[PDB]
Amino acid sequence: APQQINDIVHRTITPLIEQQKIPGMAVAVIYQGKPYYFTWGYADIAKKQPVTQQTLFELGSVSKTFTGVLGGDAIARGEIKLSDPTTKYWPELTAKQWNGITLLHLATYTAGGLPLQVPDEVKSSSDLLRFYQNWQPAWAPGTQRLYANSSIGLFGALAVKPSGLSFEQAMQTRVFQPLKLNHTWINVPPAEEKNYAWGYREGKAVHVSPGALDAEAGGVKSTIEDMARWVQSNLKPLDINEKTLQQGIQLAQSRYWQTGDMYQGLGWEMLDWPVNPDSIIIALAARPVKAITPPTPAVRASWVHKTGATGGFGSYVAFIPEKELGIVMLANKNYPNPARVDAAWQILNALQ
Ligand SMILES: OC[C@H]1O[C@@](CO)(O[C@H]2O[C@H](CO)[C@@H](O)[C@H](O)[C@H]2O)[C@@H](O)[C@@H]1O
């Protein structure tokens, strides 16, 4: 590895790991299009298993980038449109508040105040229908953003309905397989359990226990190598051979809404590059949005990023298409987002 990369990465991450008491971490830097891998510490503290380039981490909400691109591929296939009403794909959603809520609104958290979490009481499909029918929006569609798993999670479930595939089958066949992400999973198979790191919350070993729509909103587990390849694919979507997947990547990096300095994509979030690091960086935050009419196609001069967490894991991905530069940070503790972004900016700034 080039010494410049070696030095900035170790000099940034070692102190981060110490300060945040992170049990294990894997980092990939993509520099001039090529990946460089770094690992520290433990996938499993009790069994003394190290983090390796084959270790699986829970991505948490970084999974929304995969859901956004799968939705994007479905649009490119002519299976769905973001301008379509939600009721087109769920005819049993007859409650009047749904008039005017489109797939776009669901995908971008702008439906009018769908909650962060689907209630734990919702187990059955009829429980799920009841939840969305009974939900009362605070706001008109397309006026305020409230980050929500019940919003993008429903988009993911509906986006695959025309295909007739399960969400997992669609993701596997249409996104993971074409991009050769052969160690990326929504459900970790028994063959791969040996490599599934434990998450750590207040010292306790924990794995995600998915409720309704958690697969769609936060369900991906992946290795540092596959995540580097995911960044490579999002950096250069035009090198991807599957035409609908190529367009799908581009659609997920389009700017649909603006709030302050941030632009909402499908899963992905973006800021103009160069960004101030203060601007890149709370349980519920309702923010008015301006519609970008029509959406701006993927801007090469962007900082494109997404944070992700589960009870036991914290992930971050960021890239700058213009510079062919990117980073993935995977950890088996959920530590504060600003620490993630600060470390990522330190590394990418140094290498830009
Ligand atoms: O073990 C996870 C468990 O969650 C369930 C029950 O809510 O819900 C899913 O049904 C779909 C297909 O399995 C999921 O993709 C979606 O997240 C959710 O409604 C079970 O199905 C799933 O086994």
Side-chain angles (χ1 to χ4, degrees):
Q3 193 169 18
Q4 201 193 181
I5 304 177
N6 182 84
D7 290 351
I8 194 65
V9 172
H10 282 102
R11 291 168 196 182
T12 301
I13 302 295
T14 294
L16 172 65
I17 287 169
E18 271 173 42
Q19 285 174 36
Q20 305 297 152
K21 303 178 180 180
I22 287 163
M25 195 151 186
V27 172
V29 176
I30 294 81
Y31 176 79
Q32 298 177 183
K34 292 178 182 178
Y36 302 88
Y37 302 110
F38 301 84
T39 71
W40 300 258
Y42 287 85
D44 178 334
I45 293 165
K47 297 197 182 179
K48 301 159 189 197
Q49 303 293 308
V51 170
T52 68
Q53 294 170 204
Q54 297 74 30
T55 299
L56 294 165
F57 292 76
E58 294 171 7
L59 304 179
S61 300
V62 167
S63 304
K64 291 172 176 73
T65 70
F66 290 95
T67 300
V69 169
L70 180 66
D73 172 84
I75 298 162
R77 293 165 179 272
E79 292 179 347
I80 65 162
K81 291 173 250 104
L82 289 173
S83 50
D84 281 335
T86 302
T87 60
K88 183 170 172 165
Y89 306 93
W90 208 354
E92 292 91 353
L93 214 54
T94 55
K96 286 180 176 298
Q97 67 272 27
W98 289 92
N99 302 150
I101 301 178
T102 64
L103 291 187
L104 168 77
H105 294 136
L106 290 184
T108 54
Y109 324 119
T110 50
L114 278 172
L116 179 52
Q117 300 131 318
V118 180
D120 295 315
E121 69 188 24
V122 175
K123 13 271 302 191
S124 73
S125 306
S126 74
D127 276 3
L128 226 217
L129 175 59
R130 215 151 23 233
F131 166 67
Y132 286 106
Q133 286 274 78
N134 292 150
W135 162 75
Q136 294 303 127
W139 318 304
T143 63
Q144 298 189 45
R145 180 185 183 277
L146 184 64
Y147 184 79
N149 299 329
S150 70
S151 187
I152 197 165
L154 181 59
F155 168 78
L158 300 183
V160 301
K161 296 302 195 193
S163 79
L165 300 173
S166 69
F167 183 78
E168 177 169 45
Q169 268 282 301
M171 190 70 78
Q172 289 180 323
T173 67
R174 300 173 162 200
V175 178
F176 298 165
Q177 290 166 199
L179 300 174
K180 302 209 179 71
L181 313 177
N182 299 317
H183 290 91
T184 298
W185 312 104
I186 283 151
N187 290 292
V188 175
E192 316 294 332
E193 285 189 320
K194 68 187 192 298
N195 278 315
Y196 186 13
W198 284 98
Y200 291 90
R201 191 188 182 267
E202 305 180 312
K204 289 183 182 179
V206 291
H207 279 151
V208 68
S209 180
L213 300 176
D214 281 337
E216 292 82 356
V220 183
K221 297 90 190 179
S222 191
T223 66
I224 199 61
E225 284 181 3
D226 279 9
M227 292 302 293
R229 186 154 186 100
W230 183 233
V231 173
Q232 285 177 311
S233 301
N234 284 270
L235 279 170
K236 286 209 79 181
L238 301 159
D239 294 0
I240 296 153
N241 286 324
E242 296 69 18
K243 278 88 178 181
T244 62
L245 185 49
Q246 174 199 119
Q247 297 168 250
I249 292 163
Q250 283 164 306
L251 291 178
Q253 282 179 56
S254 291
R255 305 169 169 197
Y256 297 89
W257 303 99
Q258 184 181 8
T259 164
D261 292 314
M262 177 257 281
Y263 296 92
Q264 184 65 60
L266 313 174
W268 294 117
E269 301 165 15
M270 295 81 51
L271 301 86
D272 285 309
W273 180 259
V275 285
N276 49 316
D278 285 317
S279 75
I280 311 177
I281 317 173
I282 151 91
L284 174 171
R287 286 198 164 33
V289 282
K290 180 168 57 198
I292 308 298
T293 306
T296 316
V299 176
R300 275 181 70 74
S302 302
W303 174 275
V304 188
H305 77 155
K306 189 70 191 73
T307 61
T310 59
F313 288 82
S315 309
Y316 190 57
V317 176
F319 62 93
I320 309 165
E322 189 166 63
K323 304 301 201 205
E324 308 175 326
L325 186 63
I327 187 169
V328 182
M329 301 162 59
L330 307 182
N332 61 353
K333 187 186 185 183
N334 177 19
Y335 65 104
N337 290 342
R340 306 178 204 185
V341 176
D342 228 301
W345 191 80
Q346 198 81 250
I347 294 164
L348 298 194
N349 186 49
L351 298 173
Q352 130 268 69

